[PDB]
Amino acid sequence: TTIVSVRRNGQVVVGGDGQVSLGNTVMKGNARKVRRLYNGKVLAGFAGGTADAFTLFELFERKLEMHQGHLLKSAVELAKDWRTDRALRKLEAMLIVADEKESLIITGIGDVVQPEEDQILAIGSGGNYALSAARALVENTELSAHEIVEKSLRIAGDICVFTNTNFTIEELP
Amino acid sequence: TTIVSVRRNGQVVVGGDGQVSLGNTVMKGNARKVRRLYNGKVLAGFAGGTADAFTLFELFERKLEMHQGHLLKSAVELAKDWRTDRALRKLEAMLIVADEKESLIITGIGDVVQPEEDQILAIGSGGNYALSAARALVENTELSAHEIVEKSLRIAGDICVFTNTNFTIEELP
Amino acid sequence: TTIVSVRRNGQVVVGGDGQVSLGNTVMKGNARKVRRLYNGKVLAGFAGGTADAFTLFELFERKLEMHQGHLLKSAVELAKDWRTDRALRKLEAMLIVADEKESLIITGIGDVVQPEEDQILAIGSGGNYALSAARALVENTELSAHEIVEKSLRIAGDICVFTNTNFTIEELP
Amino acid sequence: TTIVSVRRNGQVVVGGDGQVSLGNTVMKGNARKVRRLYNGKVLAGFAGGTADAFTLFELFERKLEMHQGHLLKSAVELAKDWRTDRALRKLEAMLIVADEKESLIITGIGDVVQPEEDQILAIGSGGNYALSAARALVENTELSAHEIVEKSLRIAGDICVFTNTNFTIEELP
Amino acid sequence: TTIVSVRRNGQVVVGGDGQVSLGNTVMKGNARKVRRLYNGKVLAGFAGGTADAFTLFELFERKLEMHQGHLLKSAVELAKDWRTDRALRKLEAMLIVADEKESLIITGIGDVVQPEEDQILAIGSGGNYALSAARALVENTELSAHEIVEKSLRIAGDICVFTNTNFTIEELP
Amino acid sequence: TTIVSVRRNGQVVVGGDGQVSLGNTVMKGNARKVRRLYNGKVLAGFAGGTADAFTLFELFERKLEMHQGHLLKSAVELAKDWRTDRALRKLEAMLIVADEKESLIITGIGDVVQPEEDQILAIGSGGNYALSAARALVENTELSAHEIVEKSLRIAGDICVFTNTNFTIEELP
Amino acid sequence: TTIVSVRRNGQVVVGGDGQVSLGNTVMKGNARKVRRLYNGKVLAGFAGGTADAFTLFELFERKLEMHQGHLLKSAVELAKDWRTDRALRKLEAMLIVADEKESLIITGIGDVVQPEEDQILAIGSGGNYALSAARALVENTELSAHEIVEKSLRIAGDICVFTNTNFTIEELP
Amino acid sequence: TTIVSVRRNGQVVVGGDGQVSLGNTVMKGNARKVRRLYNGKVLAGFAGGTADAFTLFELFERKLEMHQGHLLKSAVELAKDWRTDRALRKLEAMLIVADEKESLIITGIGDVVQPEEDQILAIGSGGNYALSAARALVENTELSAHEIVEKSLRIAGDICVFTNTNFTIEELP
Amino acid sequence: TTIVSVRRNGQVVVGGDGQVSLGNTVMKGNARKVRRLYNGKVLAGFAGGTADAFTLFELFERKLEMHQGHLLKSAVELAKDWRTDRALRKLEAMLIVADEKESLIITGIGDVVQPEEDQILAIGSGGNYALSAARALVENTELSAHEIVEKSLRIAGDICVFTNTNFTIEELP
Amino acid sequence: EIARRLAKLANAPFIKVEAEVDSIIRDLTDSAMKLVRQQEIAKNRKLINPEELKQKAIDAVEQNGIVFIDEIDKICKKSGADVSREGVQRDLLPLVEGSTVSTKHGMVKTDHILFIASGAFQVARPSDLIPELQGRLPIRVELTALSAADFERILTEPHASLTEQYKALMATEGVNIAFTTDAVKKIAEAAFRVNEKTENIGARRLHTVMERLMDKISFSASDMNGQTVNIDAAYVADALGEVVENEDLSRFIL
Amino acid sequence: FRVNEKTENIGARRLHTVMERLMDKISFSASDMNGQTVNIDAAYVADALGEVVENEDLSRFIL
Amino acid sequence: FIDEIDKICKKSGADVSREGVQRDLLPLVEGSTVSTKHGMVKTDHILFIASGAFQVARPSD
């Protein structure tokens, strides 16, 4: 899996491949790894174990509908669920959520992370690959946050044996 | 175990061998790995640990009788049971369910998967073998979804040391 | 890697992918895993460790060179070199060799193997796939030998994370 | 693999399956695991590593060739080539050799073994199975030597995932 | 431990050795591994961990007294106890139960298994040995289900280092 | 630890060393490993983890006072506590209990074991040593059950690095 | 395997079982683990790997043959061969050698050992057992040397799963 | 992570880098590892697992607001939560807290530690590095508790592959 | 850690070093490992995991205040808490408690141990060292229980890499 | 039945309970104001004087009292998460022992009452009861299971038998019904043939059996008045059908 | 007593249960046998009840 | 009339109380004497009708 997100020019994009890898084989190579939440207010990209991916994706949807779509908060409220006396298991996966205002990354271990100056985000196996590509682009070119996230995914699919070229990208608005 | 399912020409078939392998020996070589559910409305093929196979097979029957045989949903409703705060253990097995309309695959980890354009499904040790055979067939021949699923099982039994030629195939209608 | 060779109608073809995986990254995608030996009269596909592959492949040539290019004998004479009171390094790779008259498969541990009745051989990680595929296409269609190789390689590359679709195919007129 | 040999009524027979398992897949199903040596006067069945099998089997021949085919001696001579300061590698295989007068079993570690009173020998993964069977049919029936082998191989191939029913049997008139 | 059961001529027998092996030593070599349940209506042979053997033996007695001795069912009712949302630990052992009508095998993992055409049953370390013997006999001789089960136990005790000749056999009626 | 018990001539003895071994060192070499229960009606010898030794020793005292000192039963009643749906942990130790009538051995896993014809019992690391000695004695000499149990302990302490000569022996009456 | 040797009254005896265990199965049960060397004047019992045993045993003979059969020296000279830098196969077996005057025990790593004061030696898996026994019968009875061996072997074979009761005994008049 | 704190001249400082290391990669290199608690009464530096870092940071905030900012106590009250009959999991991280009066270190295992004469504290991977630096400074120079903690962090970042030069330092008042 | 206690001449002392070792580094080298309980009626020395050390130290304080300082009993009452059906976790540490009358050692596993004739106690990594020293002293010299415990600690710090010379000793009265 | 036909055929307050505790007594008294105010209102015949009969009804219960505890086994040890099963068996001791319950009629003693506890005891056993009760329940009576021939009898001989009950309930319609002997077997053997292949509810099985039998007649007895139809072998058969084991196996068994 | 040492020792109450088994033969047919004086002695008490059951126990859960 | 009865059938180990209701409701279908605020009312002859979807459990449950 390779999920990367670039934000440039009031534009926010979040792309990811579509290779459901099982062991060293391929169960399906077209899945949607980036979905839309809150009727289309926030973008979400998951990466991890098919199951624990959703168990944390649908677990962040709750905290969104239960908080008028207040991203930056709903995230934190989710995290807090892991920082108690009675934990919530642990989830083998990470989420990249972003709306017209913010963009974040949430781990199933219970923590939220904010990008750095650039605002590039990437998670999954082929992460850093797409990341290095993005940063490479964002910093040396005047490219659309979409075109980058697209281009960056490719670079990554051509290196990660667990990532393909058939990806799905969602942007706002 | 090798469970494969092909859908072509309004025909839906689901076959699987019958080798109950224990370690590297053979406890029985005639078992039925594909059963019928809902008086004959849905086809089900299991693959995994004898026990956890049924514990998940009988667990999907409930969600069927409790939902007027609405496959595509009953599945999801089953999955959701693993995506909570209080999980349902974990089941070492996978299910391939299909009726006159849809066909799916459900893991005991809690997730549902839909086929790709070709609508071919396979699970178990000899999976991909039967799968590669199916695809091979379905794509280059005008063969009955039954004949394929039959032919595909053979190819697989002749490669997986954990699969035999004595299989049971069920189709609809 | 994935290498498969089918023969039917005085035609012998050996084809393989070109993905050189390194761990879980990809060092290269356009490699030629199948080449011609002994004055373009023998086909040889190798799969295993990038080096050992060559080292194996390279020894088999010596042998071909030393024996008027008698595919069969050369192979054995080579295999023999491990089966001695002595011993050779013990190369981590396999080869699929085949000329106008024969088709064989040689391993680094030192043993030759003839195909089964259908005259189809496959080696590599995505072998059985390519195989399963081929077997099916040979048994259920009057398809061209070369074509079967082509179709099966794909099916396999599509199932194996360590096999791509950039192929290299050599047939023996 | 499974190889067993029974002898009763001036008859000696050695039989084995023909499944060449590779990991848990099957590279071949029609192998000949038992062959004739020293001018069709000795029976040899080998089980273990496709290579080491041969390398062992081939050494025992050189020896037979060197000693007027004295089964017994040859065997010891070969074995005694292991009991010294010098070694001969640990050959991952066992042999069942037998001629008109004797019936022996040689291992790669270098030791010969005589059957117990019933003169029945079996080696391979499905050995004890074929043995148990043989022992049963020898003690409780006036069944043909060749037949017992035929029978027992089956019983064994049906319990061992690594043994098939495509047999190869050689008897010594 | 070696528990085998043969059914032929309206006769049902269930035998087992009596070697309580601990590690590689012998704590006792006369134990009764086959007991009688329901005042003498059903035969039961256990094989596994001394403790978990009984914990599953006495656990099947309940389901019997609580069901008028309806074997085939009581078994299933026991199995279902492992196929829930709240499991029953797991038991390192297997049971072979049979009465005048049926004969089964139940694992502490929670599953029931029915014999094959020859309905012969065997569990424990020396299983398949006694099994191969039984099958050998049952198929090529007109022997009493008792004599077989007796004879088959011996063969096994002479191969399994964890099985002795001092066994206890119970038949019906 | 080495606890052995011999019964001969209406005499019942139970001896054990006194080396509290911790790792490969000695924390104390005089402890009492055989205590008296029920005002002096039953003898008890423990062997295992200092803690789990007592947790099972004191756990058998309850079942004794709560059952008028009915050894053979109280034991079983204790065992049953491990054979339920809700187990009692597991105890790293074993107990040897005997009174004027019976003598047994109970494991913290939940099971009771009766001696064999000779009525000799031994548990702990140096078990079988003392056992082999006892048996040796009991069978070839007219020695007091005490003198044997004494003599047998010595033999064992001189072989087990985890057993000493400073032991405590209790007999009845 | 179990080999023990006692000496008392100008009598020396070496005895051992005959079970050749292969993993947990039994390849043979009538082996002769004790033999006579140097023109029937020295007793040798070997225990360890069927192979290495012989190679060790065989070396000790080449030595006895080279030194007028001076048990003691020969043994040392043998151990000496290992006791340098010049590495030796480092055989994994032990020997109990003894003639009219001496009784020794040699290991494959290269060292000789004299018995304690009683003049009892035991090697093999069930050694200590046979030992404990012998020790007991020597200290507490005017039993025959040969007899103690006989009895101890049994006691041991009855506790060791890797030792049988089919014995082989040689004494030195 | 590298968190160090020096106290000299009524000055208390607590610095730490900002490298969020994941595996051997860098997810972010600017995070704040030292935060302010109780409107600015106490300094806190965490080091450990992103999640368990906070779960223990926010867990010490509670014990502070619930105790009028009584550091030295609130700490102990937190510790006690791990020293019961019902523990609080365990936290993979450590905290360094200090106010105008005291300075401490609390582990997620449940224990509080007071500095030594010098009152220098350091936790995390690059701990002892910064520590050795501090001590080095504090003892041989008249440097501001801030300048030291700054200087010491650098030394550490230049040695720990898991620590950077981009750090955040907080002092009081 | 090295805690040793000697009792001679109505004098009872309990010393221990002060090296808080973490991994192979030193977090602090002056801690107090021997504290006073019950206003100064009993001496207590702990050794183990900083946390589990106290969790068991403070856990024995309760049983003391709740029992009028009846050492020998309060200990036992503490132990019993681990010998139930519902255990108290397990504590990685040991305690050495002694008052004007008795002196003991309690493990977090749940067991109490009394000294031997000499009444010398030692726990922790450098235990036996200090112990061997004590015993050495106590038995061959007329030295104050304090001077010994002091001297003994030194010997141990000079051998254990996990023990220092900076120790704290408490005696009574 | 044997405990109920020991209240009407011996006249005494009866009460069956299935394991408050004293309510077993408070209710034993509320079922006595029917053999004192229905036997002394038709015998001694106003006569009101409750204050007079608040020791004429109790003098009855105190002595003539029968308590029935159906399915008692259900309260025996084995049961660690619910030791309350031994609690009931305990709070029920004062009653079998001897105490004074305060009813809405006055204080009623128990010492002399009579208790009868039924139990299948397939799971636990007698000795699995608190020692107290084991000694205050000295009579151990062992009943037997009802056989094939036992349903052939319980179907007629007894007063109010099923044959009789449906005979009279179908005569009040103007119809007559014949229950031949060769057809009582195939009605008693067809009720046993059902208990050996499902729950063995015993006699009650018969009820469910007849109901299926008189399912054809009980409906159209009006439009067919004044007829005498014979219920024999061939009729009983083509009346219900065939009962075979579900399929159990083929579902969740490999 | 011989019964309390081989099962629950309910004490005196054991006696009640004992007699009930003893007078189980007489208490039933006392009507059809009116005006008789029968001696209850050793030989009568014996052939009145039978003999104790020392609970299987081993037979099952024991090896 | 007892609507939705199936809801009280076994399968149900953390709440055996579903078999308790089905048990305390036995005396009524069997035959007892309830004490109402009008007097003692017998039941033996009443008429019960229980409805159930029985999709989950079944009669025999």
XYZ file of N, CA and C in Angstrom, chain C residues 82-87 94 105 109-111 113-117 128 135, chain D residues 22 25-30 49-52 54-55 58-59 87-89:
108
model
N 27.964 -32.253 -9.165
C 27.604 -32.009 -7.777
C 27.522 -33.351 -7.089
N 27.046 -34.344 -7.841
C 26.848 -35.706 -7.357
C 28.092 -36.541 -7.190
N 29.206 -35.881 -6.931
C 30.466 -36.570 -6.773
C 30.871 -36.650 -5.310
N 31.854 -37.497 -5.009
C 32.352 -37.619 -3.646
C 32.853 -36.228 -3.266
N 33.214 -35.461 -4.298
C 33.717 -34.092 -4.185
C 32.562 -33.161 -3.833
N 32.196 -32.299 -4.788
C 31.093 -31.333 -4.665
C 31.427 -29.977 -5.279
N 17.834 -22.049 -10.603
C 17.430 -23.125 -11.487
C 17.450 -22.606 -12.915
N 15.127 -29.032 -17.095
C 15.166 -28.086 -16.004
C 16.308 -28.510 -15.088
N 21.533 -27.398 -7.008
C 21.938 -28.475 -6.104
C 22.468 -29.626 -6.931
N 22.143 -29.585 -8.223
C 22.624 -30.585 -9.155
C 21.771 -31.753 -9.602
N 20.660 -31.498 -10.266
C 19.849 -32.602 -10.748
C 19.070 -32.102 -11.949
N 15.780 -32.632 -14.690
C 14.419 -33.111 -14.592
C 13.741 -32.950 -15.947
N 12.989 -33.965 -16.358
C 12.274 -33.894 -17.629
C 10.844 -33.449 -17.349
N 10.199 -32.800 -18.320
C 8.826 -32.367 -18.060
C 7.928 -33.588 -17.928
N 6.671 -33.381 -17.548
C 5.744 -34.505 -17.475
C 5.253 -34.655 -18.912
N 4.219 -35.454 -19.147
C 3.749 -35.679 -20.518
C 3.394 -34.455 -21.387
N 4.515 -22.012 -10.387
C 3.281 -22.775 -10.358
C 2.112 -22.020 -10.978
N -0.693 -25.156 -18.190
C -1.350 -26.455 -18.207
C -2.790 -26.312 -18.723
N 7.939 -30.490 -3.877
C 8.885 -29.406 -3.747
C 8.236 -28.437 -2.752
N 4.313 -27.956 -3.002
C 3.798 -27.993 -4.367
C 4.372 -29.248 -4.972
N 3.922 -29.637 -6.158
C 4.461 -30.840 -6.784
C 5.057 -30.588 -8.165
N 6.380 -30.656 -8.226
C 7.118 -30.438 -9.453
C 6.901 -31.541 -10.454
N 6.536 -32.720 -9.974
C 6.325 -33.844 -10.867
C 5.590 -34.975 -10.152
N 4.859 -35.779 -10.918
C 4.130 -36.893 -10.340
C 4.476 -38.260 -10.916
N 5.252 -38.313 -12.001
C 5.595 -39.602 -12.607
C 7.057 -40.034 -12.508
N 16.467 -36.286 -0.885
C 16.615 -35.191 -1.820
C 16.851 -35.615 -3.255
N 15.991 -35.149 -4.159
C 16.135 -35.460 -5.579
C 17.611 -35.604 -5.979
N 18.472 -34.693 -5.528
C 19.900 -34.774 -5.850
C 20.559 -35.848 -5.021
N 20.794 -35.530 -3.753
C 21.417 -36.462 -2.819
C 20.944 -37.887 -3.027
N 20.044 -39.366 -5.885
C 20.915 -39.821 -6.946
C 22.372 -39.895 -6.511
N 22.945 -38.799 -6.049
C 24.333 -38.899 -5.687
C 24.605 -40.106 -4.803
N 24.087 -43.336 -6.953
C 25.153 -43.445 -7.933
C 26.465 -43.905 -7.347
N 26.663 -43.682 -6.051
C 27.895 -44.099 -5.391
C 27.845 -45.581 -5.114
N 35.427 -37.365 5.649
C 33.976 -37.485 5.565
C 33.550 -37.663 4.121
N 32.246 -37.634 3.899
C 31.728 -37.800 2.562
C 30.438 -37.015 2.422
N 30.258 -36.008 3.273
C 29.058 -35.167 3.246
C 27.863 -35.912 3.792
